[PDB]
Amino acid sequence: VSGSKKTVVAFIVMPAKNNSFTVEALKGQAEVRALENTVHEVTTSIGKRIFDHAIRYPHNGLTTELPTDLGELLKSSDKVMLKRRILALRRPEGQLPPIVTHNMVDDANDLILNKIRQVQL
Amino acid sequence: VSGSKKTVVAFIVMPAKNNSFTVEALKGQAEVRALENTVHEVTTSIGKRIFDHAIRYPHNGLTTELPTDLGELLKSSDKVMLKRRILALRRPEGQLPPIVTHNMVDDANDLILNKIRQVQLFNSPSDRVKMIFHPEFLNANNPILGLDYDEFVRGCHLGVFPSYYEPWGYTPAECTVMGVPSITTNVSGFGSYMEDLIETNQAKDYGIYIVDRRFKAPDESVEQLVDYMEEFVKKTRRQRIN
Amino acid sequence: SRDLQNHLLFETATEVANRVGGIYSVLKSKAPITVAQYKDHYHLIGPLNKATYQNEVDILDWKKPEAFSDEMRPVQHALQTMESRGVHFVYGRWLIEGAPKVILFDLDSVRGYSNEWKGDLWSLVGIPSPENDFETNDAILLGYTVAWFLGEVAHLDSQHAIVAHFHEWLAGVALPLCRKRRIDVVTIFTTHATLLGRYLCASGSFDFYNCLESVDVDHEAGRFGIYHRYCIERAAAHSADVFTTVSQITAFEAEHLLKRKPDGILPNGLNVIKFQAFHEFQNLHALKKEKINDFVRGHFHGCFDFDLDNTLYFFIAGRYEYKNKGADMFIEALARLNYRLKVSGSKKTVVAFIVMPAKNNSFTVEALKGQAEVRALENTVHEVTTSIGKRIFDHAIRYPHNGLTTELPTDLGELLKSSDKVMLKRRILALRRPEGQLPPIVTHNMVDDANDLILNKIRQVQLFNSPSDRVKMIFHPEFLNANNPILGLDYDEFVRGCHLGVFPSYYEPWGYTPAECTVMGVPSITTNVSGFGSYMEDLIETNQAKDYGIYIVDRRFKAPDESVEQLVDYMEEFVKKTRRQRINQRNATEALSDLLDWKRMGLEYVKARQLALRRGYPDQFRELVGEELNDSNMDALA
Ligand SMILES: O=P(O)(O)OC[C@H]1O[C@H](O)[C@H](O)[C@@H](O)[C@@H]1O
């Protein structure tokens, strides 16, 4: 209502009977860990090109001190793996981030989970 | 003359009387090193930005899956220290990269420097051959070239040792044991010893070049050496590897 | 008068626009080698996939007078004649290396003429055609159109001898039409399998290679609901001027089942792209193999008692076809290998991978948890070493003052604190696993675990990854892909990382798998009933072959149990090799890659295209050569 732009993530941390984490939980942290690693590869490549322009100025045609055009730093090869990482992060149409991180032994009967569904968060 | 794209940085490693490295030489490294460190810092930031964009797509109005404009990634805070490091590398108008790396004692009457001065390989841009005289022995805790001698050799492409007096010639030999081609002469022990094992036709192909300093005049020899260097320089990478 | 020195070429196939099966890859990868000899003479014909045709085809306007050269004008006017009647058709370039000109015919713009053609076909060659079989329906439409087009081109062009090549029964209908209509082109038909072949081997109870010589084809085709289709494949083989399969073993199968001995073999090439430096693929191997080590460390957490410098990776891969791709022999042979390795007291370990897609519910909790528990150990070791580095540095820098007697530290204690020890122990404790539990034999939750062939076989021979086993098993029922959270390698990457491919096929007209494996410089086991083994047998003395990393199992003249034993013999011959031996062997197998390139396999397509010319016009041929050369083979011809 107040059109706020802030966001509250609320954690409930109360031991309840479970069969450990879910696949979605683990799978998600891994797909992000992979985006991370790919980005870090791409940026050291980017660095090598920035360093070249820098060390070479103002010589072989280089008119400006720094690169001025992303295509000079991000090559086709790099664009492709980033795009694949992103695609791996995408979730099935209309699926939402779960309200629970674990597989619950008796989930239909849990008090927390029942309360949350009633209020529809 | 042949309009060659190739460049040749030639090193000369022969201990002479000196007072350690020129201040310019040590500064040059520290300056380039400091650029490197700045570039890492900048690419770390770029990374956080690529990542944010990628984790967020297609939300918050990110139309494309990747950034497309350099401005999204490279901020002006980054542009500014990068430019400060780039200015520091600047060398005063007309001044050229040295032909030596140490402060010599009796620089004037040095035989090497004088011959280089005579031929005028002063490291100017149009010179397709550059020249670096390093009047000390290679060792891995040199501030400038932290390499042991053997490491340096594996690094290079061609060893050139046109000896007139060389009973054995351990130098083109350690070079050869490490897979680097070598130019030697027929008045050197190694060169003769090798003249025996392969007929000079095939010796070129095994990366052992032998200059004729016996049945040719001094100038036919220099001309042969140069012949060799050019035949080499004409090589493709795939052929150097072979 | 026509020219045998300068001719057209029309390669027709159902997969020209679109990827369906192996054929797409073959035609694609072969494009370069062909345009480099035909340019705009060469053409590819096929049906249109309206739902995808734009991702593949740059759509050229075929009307403007520069689209075709002068001698290739007939084709343009023959294209006109098709637009007269209403025959809609995309023309353009295939967005692929070699960019060949591709004629694509829309099927829908003829669907009406269905009945007349079904009928005309029934009376010429006798081929029935139910309405519900949508494949043959499409296949008839196509064959009739392509026979039309090829007719007009023989009308107009009067300088070039026309040669048309058809691939697989689906695109073969045109072939009878060209013999009845007596049209002036020379036909080639390449079959990449046989219908009755794939079908007689489906159950897997039939003794194929011994009883096909005595099969009643019409009877079997009928038993399978296949009669109409079989007739097309048969008509194509008999109508074609030249008739070819993709391998010796399929030639056998084809002569007794399609009732015509094939004029030649046309093995499938690859587009082998070499690295600047020969030894590069060797570096790739050790990088890729590192990613595998990471998967393995994770997988065997809390149960990791062998040494990765001393373990080898075997793998099988392909469609989940338990019996035809030899998944049974493979598992069986591994259980036998496990015994032979325990008994000889070797300290080597083999980790065997099965990569065959099966219905599943993605990765298990156990698989993902382990990669992460290991990954957490990794991160913590990284924090500790940074600390250690601070303390070593503080030593070096201040020696020999403040009572530092030694150049370096001597007590591990003064480098490794106790906050450090607590951390590392905690991560180790996470890595423990329930007492009794072994590393699993599968990375996924399977839909129907209890009834799964591959898994049941593993449980039968009891390979359960117990510490004492020297052969470990890992079923990964999914295509490898670099965004898997677990084995983050694309397929080709995984291969380079492995040591040995094992593909004991029973029915495999080509087997792209071991061929592709060979091109990455990886040794592989194959069989003599596999089209790639059968092609390799003939190029290399079988004892010299093992030295090039190509082991060939006999599935034809040995007893079943003898085949398994031979398989174990090879596997075990390989495990015995030393690292220097394995390296040298890969270099050798890498060297063989040239013999699998199109630059060498395309010289068989040539030998084919020129048996169709020595047969079409023997008069113009003997003259335009020098003398008369035997013409019963593509072989005897040169
Ligand atoms: O994986 P292996 O067969 O034991 O081979 C291990 C070897 O692989 C490649 O050749 C690497 O370049 C070598 O440095 C490594 O020693």
UniProtKB/Swiss-Prot annotation, chain A:
Subcellular localization, as worded in the UniProt entry = Cytoplasm, Cytosol
Q: Where is the signal peptide?
A: none
Q: How is it modified after translation?
A: Phosphorylated by the cyclin-CDK PCL10-PHO85. Phosphorylation causes inactivation of enzyme.
| Residue numbers of Phosphoserine PTMs | 20
Tell me, how does this one assemble? Interacts with PCL10.
Q: What extra comment accompanies this record?
A: Present with 14600 molecules/cell in log phase SD medium.
**Assigned protein family:** Belongs to the glycosyltransferase 3 family.
Q: What does this protein do?
A: Glycogen synthase participates in the glycogen biosynthetic process along with glycogenin and glycogen branching enzyme. Extends the primer composed of a few glucose units formed by glycogenin by adding new glucose units to it. In this context, glycogen synthase transfers the glycosyl residue from UDP-Glc to the non-reducing end of alpha-1,4-glucan.
Protein name per UniProt = Glycogen [starch] synthase isoform 2
UniProtKB/Swiss-Prot annotation, chain C:
Q: Which residues carry this modification: Phosphoserine?
A: 158, 362, 466
Modifications made to the protein after synthesis: Phosphorylated by the cyclin-CDK PCL10-PHO85. Phosphorylation causes inactivation of enzyme.
Which keywords fit this entry according to its UniProt record? Allosteric enzyme, Cytoplasm, Glycogen biosynthesis, Glycosyltransferase, Phosphoprotein, Transferase
Stored SUPFAM superfamilies: UDP-Glycosyltransferase/glycogen phosphorylase
Subcellular location, in the record's words? Cytoplasm, Cytosol
Top class in the EC scheme: transferase
Q: Where does UDP-alpha-D-glucose bind?
A: 192, 198, 319, 508, 510-511
Q: Where does UDP bind?
A: 19, 319, 513
**What GO biological process terms are annotated to this protein in UniProt?**
glycogen biosynthetic process
Q: Which EC numbers does the record give?
A: 2.4.1.11
Relay the activity regulation note: Allosteric activation by glucose-6-phosphate, and phosphorylation by a cAMP-dependent kinase.
Q: Name one GO cellular component term.
A: cytoplasm
Reading the lineage from the top rank, the first entry is Eukaryota
A GO MF annotation of the entry reads:
glycogen binding
Name the pathway it acts in.
Glycan biosynthesis; glycogen biosynthesis
- Residue positions binding alpha-D-glucose 6-phosphate: 279-280, 282, 285, 289, 499, 582, 586
Q: Catalyzes what?
A: [(1->4)-alpha-D-glucosyl](n) + UDP-alpha-D-glucose = [(1->4)-alpha-D-glucosyl](n+1) + UDP + H(+)
Family from the record = Belongs to the glycosyltransferase 3 family.
The entry's function note states: Glycogen synthase participates in the glycogen biosynthetic process along with glycogenin and glycogen branching enzyme. Extends the primer composed of a few glucose units formed by glycogenin by adding new glucose units to it. In this context, glycogen synthase transfers the glycosyl residue from UDP-Glc to the non-reducing end of alpha-1,4-glucan.
Summarize subunit and interaction data from the UniProt record for this chain: Interacts with PCL10.
Q: What else is known?
A: Present with 14600 molecules/cell in log phase SD medium.
Q: What is this protein called?
A: Glycogen [starch] synthase isoform 2
In which organism is this protein found? Saccharomyces cerevisiae (strain ATCC 204508 / S288c)
Q: Which gene is transcribed and translated to give this protein?
A: GSY2
